[PDB]
């Protein structure tokens, strides 16, 4: 097996590709003679207002973000701090695409490309996304680079609100959490021991108990404690 996999190494580099400058050119032709980058920011923002269909305007939003992320992994092209060049541009885009629509189309498309392209280093991405202040809402709703962006004291409020409002059962364990729901449970048991008819309508008092502690979310352990606690005052006459 080790000899035949050297055949594939020769067959990959021989005939297959030219390093793509002519095949792969999305919206940028070259870096230097085209450069015009403050004014090239507007000519891509010019046609991006007059786009109607959402498919063909998001084929463009997708191919606009792909060629940038392959461009950062290679370095020393013209200037080192090109990360602030793109991050100044995208802040103009998000404030304009919140004007014509009410969504975050340019925001969510930034998350989907930053998660999928299998050449990017993850440490380089968090250094870029921290600087843009207009996309911090979309990072906290979505994919996981907001965990490393989160403050260490602010992390102990995540560990408390996750298992309080997603995992904690919403039931009421004391007699003060529902003074209305426990007040009708006792008065229904006071009533049931003052009936002459108490063996013909047993099952008419259970179906009113289950409708009381379903409407008000009463506990099932504290409720059996209240039934055994009221029915011990009336144990001399009604124990059947």
């Amino acid at each position: 097996m080790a000899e035949q996999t050297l055949l594939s190494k020769l067959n990959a580099l021989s005939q297959k590709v030219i390093p793509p400058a002519s095949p792969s050119q999305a919206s940028i032709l070259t870096e230097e003679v085209i450069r015009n980058w403050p004014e090239r920011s507007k000519t891509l923002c010019s046609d991006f207002t007059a786009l109607e269909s959402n498919d063909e305007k998001e084929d463009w939003l997708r191919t606009l973000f792909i060629e940038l992320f392959d461009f950062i992994n290679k370095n020393d092209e013209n200037s080192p701090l090109k990360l602030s060049d793109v991050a100044s541009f995208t802040n103009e885009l998000v404030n304009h695409e919140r004007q014509v629509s009410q969504a975050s189309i340019v925001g969510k498309m930034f998350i989907a490309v930053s998660s999928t392209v299998p050449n990017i280093n993850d440490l380089t991405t968090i250094s870029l996304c921290k600087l843009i202040p207009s996309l911090h809402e979309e990072l906290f709703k979505f994919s996981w680079i907001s965990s490393k962006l989160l403050n260490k004291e602010q992390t102990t409020l995540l560990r408390h609100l996750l298992k309080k409002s997603k995992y904690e059962l919403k039931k009421y364990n004391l007699l003060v959490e529902n003074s209305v729901g426990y007040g009708q449970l006792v008065a229904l048991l006071i009533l049931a021991y003052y009936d002459p008819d108490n063996f013909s309508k047993v099952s008419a008092y259970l179906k009113e108990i289950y409708h009381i502690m379903g409407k008000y979310s009463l506990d099932s352990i504290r409720t059996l404690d209240v039934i055994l606690n009221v029915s011990s005052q009336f144990i001399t006459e009604g124990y059947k």
Binding site: L157, H160, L161, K164, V176, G183
Partner: protein, 50 residues
């Protein structure tokens, strides 16, 4: 009688008063609703409404 028994137990004792500290500072630390101190004249007056 259910919600008067709590005003007695929460003004007098100070471990019950310290338990409701944590449940209001954990759910919002920057709290607009405030309970922070003694309220001592309201301690003696509120214990007379019990």
């Amino acid at each position: 009688c259910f919600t008067t028994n709590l005003i007695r137990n929460l003004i007098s004792s100070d471990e019950t008063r310290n338990f409701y500290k944590s449940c209001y500072l954990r759910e919002n630390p920057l709290s607009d609703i405030d309970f922070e101190n003694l309220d001592e004249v309201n301690k003696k007056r509120g214990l007379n409404l019990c």
